[PDB]
């Protein structure tokens, strides 16, 4: 009985061998047919259009999102302070503020101890504001110091925030060519 069972087993294995051979030749020949069909842009653009239709049929957006909450809030407050400054600023003064912010970024990265001391968030930030002002008022434009008068969680992010404000200022100066700057950056 076990021998006959092995007979049946070999018969099933033969079925599988022919089945897999047929399927493999089928898929290979189908690849050949596909590549033969895809030989001119009349097919490319039509296929892209079919995909576009299928995506129109796709379910609508389902993800709102498309270095931490405290640092993020500090960045947003910097963004609001920049909103006020830019509401006051102009392209020439914007470039002046951008240059001042790049210089103060170089300063902050040079004097690491100052960043290590200042970046600790606490209530009663006014004396920290005076410490900042004693040096910011000498070598920085009034607007750069006014924005700098603004909680970040780490010194790296606090330093990056200056570059962020400078980028915002120079991009706003560009806006006073958004598409051109975006395309050239890409």
């Amino acid at each position: 009985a076990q021998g006959a069972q092995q007979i049946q087993l070999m018969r099933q294995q033969l079925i599988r061998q022919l089945r897999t051979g047929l399927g493999a030749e089928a898929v290979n020949k189908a690849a050949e047919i596909v590549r033969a069909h895809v030989a001119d842009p009349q097919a490319q653009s039509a296929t892209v259009d079919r995909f576009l239709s299928e995506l129109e049929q796709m379910a609508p957006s389902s993800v709102v999102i498309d270095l931490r909450a405290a640092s993020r809030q500090s960045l947003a407050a910097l963004v609001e302070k920049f909103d006020s400054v830019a509401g006051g600023l102009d392209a020439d003064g914007l470039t002046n503020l951008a240059d001042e912010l790049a210089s103060v970024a170089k300063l902050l990265l040079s004097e690491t101890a100052l960043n290590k001391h200042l970046a600790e968030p606490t209530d009663d930030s006014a004396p920290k504001v005076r410490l900042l002002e004693r040096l910011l008022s000498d070598k920085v434009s009034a607007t750069t110091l006014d924005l700098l008068r603004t909680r970040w969680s780490t010194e790296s992010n606090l330093i990056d925030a200056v570059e962020h404000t400078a980028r915002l200022a120079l991009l706003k100066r560009a806006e006073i060519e958004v598409d051109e700057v975006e395309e050239q950056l890409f």
Partner: protein, 395 residues
């Protein structure tokens, strides 16, 4: 005989059924790879112990979820992996295919075939980490798992729903005993009654390929492969398969168990699983505990073995019987892993080489060996004629 209609119909059915969902899904990138471990960036929505899908068809298990990276263990050929390449999420907590079509097959721990006899018509998928049945769902072991070995069935009985550790040194009779226990079930299988026939699973961890093949053909010699499945994590395969094989075996068992069937699971052997878990944990750089083993090596075996029991009549009455094997270096039983498994299981069959070499075979040390469910897993007649043989032989 072979017919053209079946082959043509299968090919045409696949061809006509073929379709792709074109679904949007999350993407990550490998930032580190080596020794079977991979650190992947991205995948914000990844679940703990989710199956990651690497581009060479290889899979992985996301064990660590750090603030900036995901630590994954590769379950397969890690050679093909490269830093910087794409990784997808499967949307599926660690799971394995299950179904009664696995009877007679040899499968990778992931539940895909290695016997060469083609794909498996799996019934469903079951997660490898489902919770064990609680105190209330279980029932008292009251029926015997006939081993056909006098030194066991009479002196230290094994019941359905019981865990009986087989703990020995090299070449003492562990695999012999378990293979015999699997072979003896044919006289019950041929009855066709689901309430007494026993389905078997032989999990090979760290065994060399020729030993797995010798077990396979020793089972075929006796007709056991009509109802026995083999989960093979051979020595060559990465530590992941070696760590995982017992859990997929337990899942294939639990499916039949909860469907009202009676199952038997042999783990050969769990010391290799402890070694693989040690390797994996050390590659992930978890600080090890005693004897370099991972801190939670106990929780590796406990949640593997506690998940075999006898269910109550309200859940079909099915059961799963485990026979874990432990290999003891230099024949000392009072060691860490053996003493853990001794405390997780219900009884000990301790195989001593110094008895094996003096004709006492199987070499069950009558003193240390015990079955704590005992005579409740025996037929009345044996309880009469063998009610005290263990204590008498120890004296």
């Amino acid at each position: 005989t072979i017919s053209a209609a079946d082959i043509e119909g299968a090919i045409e059915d696949y061809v006509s059924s073929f379709s792709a969902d074109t679904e949007r899904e999350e993407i990550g990138t490998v930032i580190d790879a080596g020794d079977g471990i991979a650190h992947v960036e991205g995948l914000p929505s990844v679940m703990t112990q989710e199956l990651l899908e690497f581009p060479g068809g290889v899979l992985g298990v996301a064990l660590n979820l750090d603030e900036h990276s995901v630590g994954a263990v590769i379950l397969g050929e890690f050679e093909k992996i490269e830093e910087g390449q794409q990784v997808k999420r499967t949307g599926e907590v660690l799971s394995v295919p299950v179904g009664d079509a696995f009877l007679g097959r040899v499968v990778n721990p992931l539940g895909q075939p290695i016997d060469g006899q083609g794909d498996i018509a799996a019934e469903t998928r079951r997660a490898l980490e489902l919770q064990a049945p609680s105190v209330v769902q279980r029932q008292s072991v009251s029926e015997p798992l006939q081993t056909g070995i006098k030194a066991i069935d009479a002196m230290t009985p094994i019941g359905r729903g019981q865990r009986q550790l087989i703990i020995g040194d090299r070449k003492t009779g562990k695999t012999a005993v378990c293979v015999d226990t699997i072979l003896n079930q044919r006289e019950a299988w041929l009855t066709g009654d689901p309430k007494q026939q026993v389905r078997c699973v032989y999990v090979a961890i760290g065994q060399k390929g020729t030993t797995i093949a010798s077990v396979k053909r020793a089972l075929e010699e006796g007709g056991a492969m009509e109802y026995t499945t083999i989960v093979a994590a051979p020595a060559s395969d990465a530590a992941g398969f070696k760590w995982l094989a017992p859990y997929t075996g337990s899942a294939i068992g639990q499916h039949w168990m909860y469907n009202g069937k009676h199952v038997l699971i042999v783990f050969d052997d769990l010391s290799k699983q402890a070694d693989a878990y040690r390797a994996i944990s050390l590659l992930l750089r978890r600080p090890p505990g005693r004897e370099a083993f991972p801190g939670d090596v106990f929780y590796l075996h406990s949640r593997l073995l506690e998940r075999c029991a006898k269910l109550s009549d309200e859940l079909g009455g099915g059961s799963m019987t485990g026979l874990p094997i432990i290999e003891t270096k230099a024949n000392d039983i009072s060691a860490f892993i053996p003493t853990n498994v001794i405390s997780i299981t219900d009884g000990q069959c301790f195989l001593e080489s110094d008895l094996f070499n003096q004709g006492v075979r199987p070499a069950i040390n009558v003193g240390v060996s015990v079955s704590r469910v005992g005579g409740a897993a025996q037929i009345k007649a044996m309880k009469e004629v063998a009610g005290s043989l263990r204590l008498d032989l120890s004296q």
